[PDB]
Design a protein around this ligand. Structure first.
Ligand SMILES: Nc1nc2c(ncn2[C@@H]2O[C@H](COP(=O)(O)OP(=O)(O)OP(=O)(O)O)[C@@H](O)[C@H]2O)c(=O)[nH]1
Lengths: 49, 50, 292, 49, 50, 81
């Protein structure tokens, strides 16, 4: 049998398995990048599909 | 005693690249200029390598 | 290694597929009895499903043990899955495709690069038969191998809504599914299904042959149909509720018609374009195996 | 402007093939002195009506 | 490879190609390691020039 | 419109157009008239246009589908309007 979902029934449960991220995963940090500007503005292609 | 196979190989490479640049169609006049100068710079690279 | 029985791995109680329903662990078949249909004027005609590409995408050199079952189920059934082809780990099934590979597919649904202690796993031959087809999920997004995501849904409808006569005919009216429902029914159905150990189902579907495969196809038709139901709700153009004298009838219109919707909704899981490409590929492969 | 448009639609340059005919570039473009040692000619000076 | 953004419009862009060739001559091994990443640049060069 | 004037004008105009192309010995080729005309109409400013300019030979094709595939792959574009 599969277990009954805790949210399906009206009983309260005080031991639960909360997933969480370790120090290795990080989110919402700012991220460094090397931007490289076009060599000549006149050579830029605005158009093609 | 005289020929250096490395340098000769770079000669054929630069010759190829030069005829590659020469054959390159260009629109702007300035590109036509850089096309002609790049070949000279190539020639210079060849002597520096040799 | 768990040896595969004369029947499928699905004969083992360890891989029961059940949806929670009316306070019990209902078998999917007895949920589908709740389903009812309202034909519309429109018609589904099933076309031949194109033969899947011979090309198994190369497994990339991946150091880790990919959790394949989780990826597949979340792609087909997950409430929050997105960009399922960007990570591109389905190609990993191809690692199991080789004869005498060191890789094992654990009952966990993980793809170990090497057999490892105290981790039970499916018999490598059966897994090889499985991967030899399902690795092609690994090219669900590559343009040359993308499945049709429109026509294939007809088969879904036929295998779901279709009466035996309509299935023999190969055509059925576009139907509209309905069942008496509790709050958040389709979400809960989808989560009860995402928890399924469907690798057992697919492995048995690919490995079995002759009488065993046929007995499997009948014993497990309603499991397949449940997966088809979750998937179809993911592509149903709309999913309304109807009052019916102090009861509420959930109604999804329509079965067998992919509306290609990608906007999210509370009622059911949603396919992003990538999830569509994946489901389309999955249905191509799985329907191919289902008919032989 | 109109004579110019016709002229430049014939092209800013030309080459002379082995037959001795002038094949015009058919393409508007500025001249550079690089082209002076090329097979190309400024078209204004073709004297071709 | 330390990535190079290069459209290859100007003939002078041949410099980058040469930069690779020299690297492939002076350092065949290290080149052989970074060479697919080099192919990503070269493919731009070819799609534009050839 | 008097016929002599419509004729003299249409003639001068037609003589004015000069599609970019490479001539070739092979009997299997067709010039890709659509793409070459389109590159002309935009004075070869569009990426397909400057493609046609640096490689006029890309308009020649033996297989009709590759006439466009070669351009789509050279350009990285998914389509052309
Ligand atoms: N600019 C341009 N448009 C083209 C060219 N060739 C085809 N088309 C357009 O492509 C479109 C698609 O083809 P169809 O409309 O089916 O063909 P059609 O020209 O109307 O001829 P029929 O259908 O036989 O009557 C047409 O609207 C054409 O105008 C071309 O070389 N240059």
């Amino acid at each position: 049998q599969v277990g009954i979902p805790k949210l399906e029934v009206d009983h309260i449960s005080f031991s639960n398995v909360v997933s969480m991220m370790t120090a290795n995963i990080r989110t919402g940090d700012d991220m460094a990048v090397e931007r490289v500007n076009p060599d000549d503005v006149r050579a830029i292609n605005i158009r093609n599909a | 005693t005289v020929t250096n196979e490395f340098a000769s190989r770079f000669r054929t490479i630069v010759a190829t690249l030069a005829n590659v640049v020469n054959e390159r169609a260009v629109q702007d006049d300035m590109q036509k200029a850089t096309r002609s100068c790049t070949k000279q710079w190539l020639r210079h690279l060849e002597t520096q390598f040799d | 290694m768990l040896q595969q029985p004369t029947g499928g791995y699905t004969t083992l109680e360890q891989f029961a597929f059940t949806i929670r329903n009316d306070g019990t662990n209902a078998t999917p078949t007895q949920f589908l009895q709740l389903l009812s249909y309202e034909a519309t004027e429109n018609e589904l005609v099933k076309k031949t499903i194109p033969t899947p590409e011979t090309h198994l995408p190369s497994a990339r050199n991946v150091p880790g043990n990919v959790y394949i079952e989780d990826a597949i189920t979340q792609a087909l059934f997950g409430i929050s899955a997105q960009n399922v082809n960007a990570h591109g780990y389905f190609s990993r099934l191809s690692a199991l495709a080789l004869p005498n590979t060191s890789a094992r597919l654990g009952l966990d649904g993980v793809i170990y690069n090497s057999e490892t202690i105290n981790i039970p796993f499916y018999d490598p031959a059966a897994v090889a038969n499985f991967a030899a087809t399902y690795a092609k999920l690994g090219n669900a997004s590559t343009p040359r191998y993308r499945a049709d995501m429109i026509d294939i849904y007809a088969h879904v409808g036929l295998e779901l809504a279709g009466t035996d006569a309509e299935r023999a005919a190969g055509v059925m009216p576009v139907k509209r599914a309905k069942f008496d429902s509790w709050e958040g029914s389709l979400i809960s159905l989808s989560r009860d299904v995402v928890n399924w150990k469907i690798l057992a189902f697919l492995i048995d579907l690919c490995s079995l042959e002759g009488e065993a495969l046929r007995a499997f196809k009948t014993r497990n038709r309603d499991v397949f149909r449940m997966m088809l139901f979750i998937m179809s709700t993911a592509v149903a153009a709309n999913v309304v509720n109807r009052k019916v004298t102090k009861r509420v009838d959930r109604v999804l219109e329509y079965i067998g018609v992919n509306s290609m919707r990608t906007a999210g909704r509370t009622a059911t899981i949603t396919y992003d374009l990538s999830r569509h490409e994946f489901a389309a590929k999955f249905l191509q492969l799985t329907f191919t195996r289902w008919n032989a | 402007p109109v004579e110019y448009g016709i002229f430049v639609q014939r092209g800013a340059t030309y080459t002379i093939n082995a037959a001795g005919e002038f094949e015009f570039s058919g393409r508007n473009e500025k001249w550079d002195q690089a082209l002076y040692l090329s097979e190309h000619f400024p078209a204004l000076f073709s004297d071709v009506p | 490879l330390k990535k190079i953004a290069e459209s290859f419009e100007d003939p002078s862009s041949i410099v980058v190609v040469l930069e690779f060739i020299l690297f492939a001559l002076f350092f065949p091994t290290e080149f052989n390691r970074i060479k697919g990443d080099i192919q990503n640049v070269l493919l731009l060069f070819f799609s534009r020039w050839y | 419109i008097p016929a002599d004037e419509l004729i003299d004008n249409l003639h001068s105009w037609m003589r004015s157009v000069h599609l970019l192309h490479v001539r070739s010995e092979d009997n299997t080729l067709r010039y890709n008239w659509m793409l070459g005309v389109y590159a002309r109409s935009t004075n070869y400013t569009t990426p397909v246009g400057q493609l046609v300019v640096n490689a006029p030979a890309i308009l020649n094709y033996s297989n009709p589908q590759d006439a466009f595939n070669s351009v789509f792959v050279a350009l990285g574009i998914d389509y052309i309007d």
